[model samples]
Target chain A: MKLEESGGGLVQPGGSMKLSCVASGFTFSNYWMNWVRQSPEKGLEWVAQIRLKSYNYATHYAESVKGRFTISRDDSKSSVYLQMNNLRAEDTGIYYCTPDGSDYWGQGTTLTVSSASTKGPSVFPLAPSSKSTSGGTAALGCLVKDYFPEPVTVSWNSGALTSGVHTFPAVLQSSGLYSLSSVVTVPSSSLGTQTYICNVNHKPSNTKVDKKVEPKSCHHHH
Target chain B: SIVMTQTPKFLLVSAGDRVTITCKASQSVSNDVAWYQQKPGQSPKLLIYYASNRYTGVPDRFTGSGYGTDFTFTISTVQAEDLAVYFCQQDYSSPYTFGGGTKLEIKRTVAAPSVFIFPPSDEQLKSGTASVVCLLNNFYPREAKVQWKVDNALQSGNSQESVTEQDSKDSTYSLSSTLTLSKADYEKHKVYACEVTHQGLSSPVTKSFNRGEC
Candidate 1:
């Protein structure tokens, strides 16, 4: 019995998000489909469940989400769906659609509910560290700070030049914002001839910032 | 306060063998005992109700008998597909309870679980933390152990594992384990793995997770 769950999005408070699960390897209409979710807090909660009962479908929702969680299915299509309305920050989580016992599960789809205090991040490129340059390698670090609603992406320039890159987790700052660092190392001799790029993508603000460093010097770019 | 006790936590028998499970109640429950058959992956299906009446569609080979405090569920001749767990529940009291289930197994059969690791989604990574799950699907001999490792070094972080789950479809067992780490650690390391140890296999099954790979 296999289930593949799909559909997730970044919804603002009061918005709605609909998710689905396609059942395979077993008769879809014969068994109950359960929707379960887990949040960042390490708590697992049952959202809702549905199954084809006789010629109709029957559903049950958890008390906590009953008012906002709507579970449905199309037996002919071998799929089930849960459409949640009135989204809240507390509703963000990874959702899994499973059979009755949850023995077989989908890979899980992540749902993000934008918080009211969401903010974009700042990209700051640190000074080039040449301590290892004498050994033919030099490292450059980029710091991304003040982002809210987590999840920022940091990437280097294209191709083989992307090697030896490392990123750190975003640390929640006392100011209520978050910060993280990413560093990349390259051949020391190539520094003067090459321009290194650090790109940061913050989804909430739909912003992309780049920090370009030339010949051991750094500057903020678009 | 009535206690329901099931005799023989496990039973090993070959096809065609006769099997009987007994559930004893601390006090009289009359004919309120209900017997259920649960496959590994499926919900429990009612087999017998009101002590002896078979549920519709249930085979005649499955039967229930006995009185107020003692009840027995029997399989006249076990079929290969009859392998599953059986439980006796009391419906007479305001607060009903179920007896510990009796697991029926086909003797000398063993199947090892298949390990599959799922990487954290891009959205989760962007959130600054990555939570990944490892599925150990379709195995036999329910007992198993799971552990996580980063670049071959065993981890002891925020990892959680589910109870051994059974799939009645093929009479095998399955389960999942999760590991949550900072997106920093995920990017800093090369590999994360889930290691499972089970008696059904000679060596532990190991499944790894890499950001570049699914």
Candidate 2:
């Protein structure tokens, strides 16, 4: 009924890591060794599994990570191993090894893949638009794109105090770059020749990009 | 609802040979029968569920057939890793039962260990004690026993043995044993023998160390 997991710590993106789960209080060799990982982005993904018979063994891996993941074991030590290659930021999570037909799980191993690449995000301001609601509100949209190692911050600096900002999660593009959007809402009545600035920051690279927008007043609503 | 019975409790075949094991239920089990493959020291894993459907990730070489009372599991071209025990189980009703396991083993040539008996170390001799070592190398099946004898008399309770060391590359085993005694007895004894008994041998293999010869 006792299980302990080890071998997980900070790893660089594109690097490899190995982990193990040791079992006791039961017959460790009499069950399939299974590894599962949990993260906020992807919940409970099976990494791989290995089973031993006599002097031989068999292994099956998850298709999602087949090429990069391998599972094996050491019978005498009553432990199972998990090897991961080509890790990325998204691979950060807590890993657990559970034996089939047993009511036990290893104390999770936390894996953190340190931030992304050096290419900072490119900030682009879309055509500003205004809508009528009470005194009317202007929407300023800033597109943050082509960033590696996601962890970008987008802020609105109208050169005045403001609120109502919405930012979406970064999406990985086919080019292996991350893209996201940030929008800030403000009163359209004060849009008389006013300029809204979008500040995009790539924290790891210590880089920032800014875009400016000019929203038309509600009198010229579109 | 019915008991599951499997035939041929053991099988010996070469790699790449095709083999099949049959299971029968006292009553119709329909598609509720399942087949499991259990490796030595590992828990049973599902091979075929719903009588004839191979479980996810199972190799295509394995297949299942039949319904109702009789079911069969077959490996078309068994690989070396396919040597394991297979079982059939019925899940059609309460109190599920499994058939007697059928072990599939590869018939290969077995080898015996080469034994060695080392004389007591000079350091131990100077320390008023003697420690003799025995090494058994390259044996199969991991079933070997070691015994120590002094002047043709069996000696016990003063020896330490190591667990079998299995080689992953050749599937062979090795082990070592040590005998401890006072240096006075080591010098007084004329002969000491280390004997190893294994299934691959018709008689125990012995190696001797002689104080008079030195």
Misplaced by over 4 Å in model 1 are A1-222, B1-5, B8-16, B27-33, B38-45, B79-85, B89-108
Please write out the lDDT profile of model 1 over residues A127-186, one tens digit for every residue: 343322335666555657678866787888743355555555566665667766665557
Q: Tell me each candidate's TM-score.
A: 0.44, 0.39
> How many collisions between residues are there in candidate 1?
8
Give me the overall lDDT of model 1: 0.71
TM-score (C-alpha, index-matched) for candidate 1: 0.44
Clashes in model 1: which pairs?
A151-B126, A151-B127, A169-B184, B40-B166, B40-B167, B40-B168, B41-B167, B41-B168
Q: Per-residue lDDT tens digits of candidate 2, residues A64-89?
A: 66789888988789998889999877
Q: Write the per-residue lDDT of candidate 1 for residues B119-164, one digit (tens) a residue.
A: 5554457778676656565577768888888889988846755534
lDDT (CA) per prediction? 0.71, 0.69
Candidate 2 colliding pairs? A29-B41, A30-B43, A31-B43, A53-B39, A53-B40, A54-B40, A116-A149
Query: What shift in Å separates residue A10 of candidate 1 from its native position after superposition?
Result: 24
